[PDB]
Amino acid sequence: NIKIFSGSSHQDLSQKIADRLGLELGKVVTKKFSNQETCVEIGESVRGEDVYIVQSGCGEINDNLMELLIMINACKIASASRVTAVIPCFPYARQDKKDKSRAPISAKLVANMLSVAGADHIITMDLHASQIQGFFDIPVDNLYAEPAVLKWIRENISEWRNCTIVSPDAGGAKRVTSIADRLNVDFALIHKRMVLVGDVKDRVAILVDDMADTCGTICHAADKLLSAGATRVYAILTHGIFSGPAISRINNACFEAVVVTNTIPQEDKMKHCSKIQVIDISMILAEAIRRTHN
Amino acid sequence: PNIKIFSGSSHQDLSQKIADRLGLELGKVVTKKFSNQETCVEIGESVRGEDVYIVQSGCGEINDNLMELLIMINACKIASASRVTAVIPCFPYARQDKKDKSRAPISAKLVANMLSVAGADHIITMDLHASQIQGFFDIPVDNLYAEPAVLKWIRENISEWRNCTIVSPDAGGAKRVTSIADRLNVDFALIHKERMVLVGDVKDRVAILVDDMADTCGTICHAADKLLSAGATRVYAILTHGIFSGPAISRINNACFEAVVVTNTIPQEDKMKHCSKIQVIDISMILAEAIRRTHNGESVSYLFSHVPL
Amino acid sequence: PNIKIFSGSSHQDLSQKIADRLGLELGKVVTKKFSNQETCVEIGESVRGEDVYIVQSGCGEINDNLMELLIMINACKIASASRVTAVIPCFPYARQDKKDKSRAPISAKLVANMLSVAGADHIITMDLHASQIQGFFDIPVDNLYAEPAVLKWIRENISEWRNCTIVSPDAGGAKRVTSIADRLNVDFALIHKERMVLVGDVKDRVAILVDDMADTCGTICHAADKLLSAGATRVYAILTHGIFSGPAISRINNACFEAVVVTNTIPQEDKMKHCSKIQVIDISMILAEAIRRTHNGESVSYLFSHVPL
Amino acid sequence: PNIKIFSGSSHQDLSQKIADRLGLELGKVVTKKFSNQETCVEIGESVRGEDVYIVQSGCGEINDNLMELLIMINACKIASASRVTAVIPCFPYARQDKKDKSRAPISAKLVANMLSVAGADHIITMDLHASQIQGFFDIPVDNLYAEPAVLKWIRENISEWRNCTIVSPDAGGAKRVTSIADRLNVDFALIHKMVLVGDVKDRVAILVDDMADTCGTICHAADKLLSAGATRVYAILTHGIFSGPAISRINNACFEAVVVTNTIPQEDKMKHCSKIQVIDISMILAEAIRRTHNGESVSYLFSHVP
Amino acid sequence: SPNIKIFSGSSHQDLSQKIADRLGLELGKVVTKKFSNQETCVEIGESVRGEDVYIVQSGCGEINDNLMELLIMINACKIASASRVTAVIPCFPYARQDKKDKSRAPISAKLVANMLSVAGADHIITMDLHASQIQGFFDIPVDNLYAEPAVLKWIRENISEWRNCTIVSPDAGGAKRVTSIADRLNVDFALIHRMVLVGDVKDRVAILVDDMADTCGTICHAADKLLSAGATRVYAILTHGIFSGPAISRINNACFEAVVVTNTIPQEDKMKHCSKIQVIDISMILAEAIRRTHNGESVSYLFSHVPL
Amino acid sequence: SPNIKIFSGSSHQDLSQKIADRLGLELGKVVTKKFSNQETCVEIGESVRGEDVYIVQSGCGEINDNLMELLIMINACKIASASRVTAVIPCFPYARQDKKDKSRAPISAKLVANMLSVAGADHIITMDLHASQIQGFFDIPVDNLYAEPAVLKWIRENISEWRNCTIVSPDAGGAKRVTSIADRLNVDFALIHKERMVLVGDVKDRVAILVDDMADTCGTICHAADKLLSAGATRVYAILTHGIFSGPAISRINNACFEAVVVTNTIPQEDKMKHCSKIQVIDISMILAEAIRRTHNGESVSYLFSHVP
Ligand SMILES: Nc1nc2c(ncn2[C@@H]2O[C@H](COP(=O)(O)OP(=O)(O)O)[C@@H](O)[C@H]2O)c(=O)[nH]1
Ligand SMILES: Nc1nc2c(ncn2[C@@H]2O[C@H](COP(=O)(O)OP(=O)(O)O)[C@@H](O)[C@H]2O)c(=O)[nH]1
Ligand SMILES: Nc1nc2c(ncn2[C@@H]2O[C@H](COP(=O)(O)OP(=O)(O)O)[C@@H](O)[C@H]2O)c(=O)[nH]1
Ligand SMILES: Nc1nc2c(ncn2[C@@H]2O[C@H](COP(=O)(O)OP(=O)(O)O)[C@@H](O)[C@H]2O)c(=O)[nH]1
Ligand SMILES: O=P(O)(O)OC[C@H]1O[C@H](O)[C@H](O)[C@@H]1O
Ligand SMILES: O=P(O)(O)OC[C@H]1O[C@H](O)[C@H](O)[C@@H]1O
Ligand SMILES: O=P(O)(O)OC[C@H]1O[C@H](O)[C@H](O)[C@@H]1O
Ligand SMILES: O=P(O)(O)OC[C@H]1O[C@H](O)[C@H](O)[C@@H]1O
Ligand SMILES: O=P(O)(O)OC[C@H]1O[C@H](O)[C@H](O)[C@@H]1O
């Protein structure tokens, strides 16, 4: 049967997942030692169980990554039948190639540390680059928020039939042209001094990318989109990291709303920013766990 | 502890140019097929203690050349070679780099694992379809760019290059073309299939389509037709990998290109004989230089700012 | 009860016979090639939690079938199948199982490592060239014998079998023929190349050459004529693997065989059209029984003493 | 090959001291964190064909320094280094070296395997909590001793060292002090919970263990040693973790000195605690690096110091 | 539930028989001998397809022959399509070589752990590892069982003055073990380290406790020191009864009232030639570990209680 | 630049000493004993840091203690920062268990190859593997040396009538070993098969030489010898590479009808020669020493297969 465990990163999403599966949380004490070493004490048997550990790459990332690895190692030495790392926001994903001299491929390093910890399956959401599925030798589910983003647009944008949907960088063109084609609307591209390609005159601009970290690029992209004359600017990003001065920049930018999923906890950031709206996706992870559980 | 260079049956000319630029001959290897079509590899010289480089591109009957490459690596490895480096100009199975459909394979990662398990210690390639294939291994992977030699070609061959527009034939290729456009200080544009859509205005100016490869060339021929319809003085196509499979030559001859420019990661002499529009950017000096720097133990970053020769 | 059988492009007939004998349908898989000759594999039905068997024989265009097999294994493995078993009746690269020359590869071990790294958990094959290839893995390898079905054939079709002579065309095929001689209670003989030399009798007796495979068939045709010039009644040739590459068919048409008997580890339908001496032994029930017993607990030890049907 | 030594963000002073003692400068690495708290590592000079040494101790925010160390190892490995050696003065997660509870992790082995897959070919550390951690790998792991340097400190600083009594504050540490007391040919003692076994009457008492974290079990162990009547009490621990309430407890305790090595930085601790003294072990690590480079035996560093 | 098979090696057949008997099973059909040239011969005479296999081999009596036999049995079961192969090793061999305390020294214990891993072992069940950190040699579950509950029950039921005894360590290495026992009995402890004794064995009973007894030189010299310090009776309760070389002669001449070991190593032949040696059948602790590991329960019971 | 060291195990110190003498080296400082409880104790009393280490241990005389000793020495040198560890094993143990011929049978040879691999061996140097395919049980270079040269030289220098002798295989499995030797001598050949013992070939009126790779209990060579005399041969010799002579072997050869029984010193023969006057030994220490010298440097060992230094 199923045991779902939660790490100290995003207890809310784990609770939603376990509720949707009709389970309890697997009882785990997750803290730090006096000298900041990660302390993981699982307080119930997992012998013969299919265990799922929910830990997102957010907060103090290395503590949560190491916590996840230690939970995997404990469950593996605990004679668990299978250990699955549920990672809604995959850490170190932007370091997925050697783009400069002597650079590390940190995402690949993370994939190998999960492998040697004892992970048998990975369930994640909107990988920055899909090719990260190839960093392993085990099944890696790359889930999409695209149905939930489409539904959010259709249910919240009055003028969605005549929007355009825009990318703030180059790399995000393929992500955008999908949903633009799925809504049957135009599309546009913003590149870095900032240049705009496409027609967003007298319509609604929805910026879409996989992630929003410092939000400098989407804020200057919204400013370019107002320069080109757009009745309203939205930003729908899957992972709402919001690091550093991000909140200040979205509060001063001219967005109608800024939409993210709950791959990362947003309550405290939503308290300091009124434009933020969060989507479900917890039902998408539960169905990947239940589908995985044969 | 010097260099031994061997050639596979997938591109002996490129191996010949590389060994020539390095002041070498090429290793004595017989690479044929058995009566029942099994690969036969006979290394005809000692390779003990040598730094071996094997040149095999993903082209032709791809699985025969891939299997030949793997057998060459394994023989050299149990031949007590000091190091074995697979130089793979066009990396095969690169478009199968993820699990997009329901039960699809990641063939590129499988290939990376067969190269790893054969005994490869180093990979030297050019313009990987996805750069993340460098992460499919646990060994160094040089992802060489043809971008500098393409820039040099454009400047030395395009009269109106100062006011051209670099166009991406698909969505996915926007990063490449904005890189090149930023390097020439020109404009860029994008074409998206669905009717085919053009964004970025290429009116009354030269249009250069740039992507990593040309297989069946349907997408770049349709893109070129759209560039004419939008009113573009001239339309070029500069692609790194000249696969040209199927009706590709028919489609390029029946399109409106002034030239279609590729590198010699794949043999092009037979293709150029049947298509007066195809131009080749010899990149054997970039591969020869990367091998030499790899041997000495020097930094290959020079190869991303300047063209040799 | 959770069993799936997928077929490659090499021996679809044998796959259908096996699935028929197990009362199953073949799994939904599209297995073709891309425009640039890369292998294209989409398994079109779930294998989640299933006991998967992939039947691909080492024959035809061998490297395309090997890559197809590896891509199917890796796909099923990433598709969360419980176990993936490669049913390979004729093992490719099996004759390359040692280092006899100064720089030779052990291609059989390379293949064992590529099947292992793809995700294979079990191997089911028939009459390995060398049995020690079982040790090239680290997973169970069922090496089935055609010996019982050959014994049944010899008993039921050769009238003078009680006083025949089982002959080896080379050395090393001595154990194969001595086991059949001890099991039929008959005589054995041996032929060594070096002008060919025969040791043993065959005078005024039916002669039966037995080996594991027949590729170019030069040695068994010269062996046949030597057996007639030593004064033998007839000459048969019973080989497990048909292959028949190169000029083999032409040579069998001119040789003096009464019959050439093979199993259907390799398709023989096209071969039988051009050679009237070729008779085929259906071994689909031995492979089907290996699969059904492998699914359940049940020991495969049957398939080495008596024939299923 | 030629030697390059790199520093992590943990204990930069020890890295500089080591590089100076080897007559080298530290290599160019920028090691910081991203806006979203991910580790950023940029090695700014070629290491192709080099024998690289990366000095990172298990201290401070340990998971950030461990993850940073792993990223440096991986970068140097893809940067075509000839050999990558992790110099780790204090090995993190070492106290998780066995399974004494249900569902417990063996975090020390997890770290050993992450170092292995990162690309480490050699490990140089000092006084592992348990020596058997050398077996968590399949690559050379040097477990150096501070014992000659603590002995030299104690002969050179304790006048009554000829007639002292070395004490273990817990059970598990009974062998270490027998290795040291017998090396001084002096009395030894033991404390368990507190009850004391061994003599400590009018003698002066020297606590020796591998660590001292929060120091509760050595502050109480000092109180028991005074109650049994010893002139002064000395605490000599290898790794100066001093986390949590450690400083307050030593400031309110009756130590003559608390001596640690510089496997972990102590400067911030020493400005706030007059009782902390540090032993320089930078030459003991430098000599193992030098011997490891040009192929000598580090056995000498367990009996002679520099 | 029952798809389990249990097999024996050539080392401790009595323990194998007791374990299988306690589980209500018969021992599996394996012929285990040596070839003419002294190579190990292993013939499993029954199917293990889909089975949860347990192989009982202790590190004792011609160690390399039994270790190599164990590895060959694991590999045979692995190629025989067993679902899981568990090595039950009551006394884990080469455990004293668990670190590098010398130049050019081997970690023989780690080598053995890697040979068991590469042979095909999926699980290890052992008792009183010399060092518990050997659990970290394996990357697989390793049960490190204790004789501590059975040693305490034996003490309470056989030492009358056990409430005022003295649990003594024969070397500096058993201080963790004996304090544990000392705390469980609520008694005093002592240590012996040239003969130096620290602790107060007053005029009472001294019980030496360690993990094993090989030659028995240390427990006997510790017994002499415990005499000279004036102690009533002295005992020795050791988990692993290796007793090699002149060990029995030295126990017969030493001042022991009794010397108690477990049956991780065969002791019947040893007990016939020494009236002092007593054995604590621990076959039920191993059987209940096999039974719980099959059908997947928690073995932590076995450290608080002694099932018969 | 000699970084070469050479240790010896407890199995064959004489052969190690001859090898090191021929290489102009001293034997490495190793104490190899047993603990009180019969556990293997290995203390290397010399640095091997950065050295090319060779450990000479043969599979003979109490196999498991010598195998375990070899493994502990490899592991010690590997953790001792040795540059490379090469296991020089003249007689490779467990070679006869190289396949699964019965149900639940072990492939002990592959297990041994995996324990040598996991100990840290980078190279294996052996002589006359029972099956050559055992080279594929590894993933590291394995030199399979032949005793065929020096056996040819022995026959020529000791048998007067060798120009018309007959090389006989005692079993159906050594026929390839025989056919080789005979072709190099240009002599007849024959084969013996225990079915009742049967002889195939001609050995009437001329000298007969039984040749196989080893002699364990010697049960077959002796009955084959009486068969060779009942079939009428002047003399009978027995030349085996590996002189194991276990069990009743010496008792059987002393009453056997051999002119001589010739073995190599892959196994110590001194005590065996004391109890059997018919035993001749061939020194192959120069073939092992040359395999080591060429393996160290970087030279083709393949000379050793037709020359005899
Ligand atoms: N992972 C895990 N280990 C268990 C469980 N139950 C028992 N163990 C065993 O417990 C041992 C270590 O903890 P344990 O002995 O129970 O703690 P102790 O009884 O206080 O010494 C190992 O042998 C584990 O195999 C369980 O449910 N999960
Ligand atoms: N790879 C390689 N192998 C060599 C070389 N020189 C000798 N060999 C050896 O040659 C052997 C195979 O060639 P050969 O002696 O003709 O085979 P054999 O006579 O049938 O055993 C192998 O054992 C190799 O180790 C060399 O330069 N390279
Ligand atoms: N790790 C490492 N990579 C190097 C070194 N020298 C050159 N490189 C190469 O630098 C390449 C980076 O390519 P690119 O994305 O164009 O970065 P660029 O070299 O700065 O232009 C990598 O693919 C490496 O092959 C080196 O010393 N170490
Ligand atoms: N290990 C094992 N092998 C089995 C079992 N049942 C059948 N086998 C087969 O046994 C074969 C070798 O033994 P066997 O068939 O009896 O003798 P053979 O005539 O040499 O094939 C292998 O090819 C296996 O496929 C089993 O339960 N366990
Ligand atoms: O373009 P499609 O033929 O649709 O897809 C494959 C394309 O691959 C290359 O980009 C060619 O230009 C082909 O057109
Ligand atoms: O030897 P060839 O005639 O050329 O090739 C076919 C032979 O291949 C093997 O030797 C078989 O015995 C076949 O008779
Ligand atoms: O003392 P408490 O258990 O906090 O733990 C801290 C101890 O950690 C080690 O034992 C040190 O000697 C410290 O005294
Ligand atoms: O006493 P020794 O002969 O030195 O060695 C064997 C005995 O002492 C050792 O520590 C073992 O524990 C045995 O108890
Ligand atoms: O005669 P056996 O008992 O079979 O074994 C000893 C034989 O072992 C070898 O294979 C030779 O044929 C020897 O004569």
Numbering used by the authors:
A (entry chain D): 3 to 194, 204 to 305
B (entry chain C), C (entry chain B): 2 to 195, 204 to 318
D (entry chain E): 2 to 194, 205 to 317
E (entry chain F): 1 to 193, 204 to 318
F (entry chain A): 1 to 195, 204 to 317
Authors' own words:
Phosphoribosyl pyrophosphate synthetase (PRPS) stands as the first and rate-limiting enzyme in the purine biosynthesis pathway. It catalyzes the pyrophosphorylation of D-ribose-5-phosphate (R5P), obtained from the glucose pentose phosphate pathway (PPP), at the 1’ hydroxyl group position, yielding the catalytic product 5-phosphoribosyl-ɑ-1-pyrophosphate (PRPP). PRPP serves as an essential metabolic intermediate for purine biosynthesis via both de novo and salvage pathways, as well as for the synthesis of pyrimidines, amino acids (tryptophan and histidine), and co-factors (NAD+ and NADP+). Conversely, PRPS2 displays ~94% identity with PRPS1 and shares exactly the same biochemical reaction.
In addition to conventional enzymatic catalysis, PRPS enzymes are downregulated through allosteric feedback inhibition by downstream nucleotide biosynthesis products ADP or GDP21. To avoid potential confusing, we chose to use GDP instead to ADP specifically for the allosteric inhibition regulation study as GDP does not bind to the catalytic pocket as a substrate competitor. To explain these unexpected variations, we determined the structure of PRPS1 in complex with R5P, ApCpp, Cd2+ ion, and GDP by co-crystallization. The GDP ligand was positioned at the allosteric site between Loop2 and the C-terminal α12’ helix of PRPS1 with pocket volume 33 Å3, stabilizing the conformations of Loop2 and the α12’ helix for catalysis. Strikingly, in vitro feedback inhibition assays indicated that the enzymatic activity of PRPS1 was inhibited by GDP with an IC50 value of 706 µM, while that of PRPS2 was unaffected by up to 10 mM GDP, suggesting that PRPS2 was insensitive to feedback inhibition. Indeed, PRPS2 binds with GDP with extremely weak affinity (Kd > 200 µM), whereas PRPS1 bound GDP with a Kd value of 10 µM. In contrast, 3AA in PRPS2 sterically blocked GDP binding at the allosteric site, abolishing the feedback inhibition response of PRPS2.
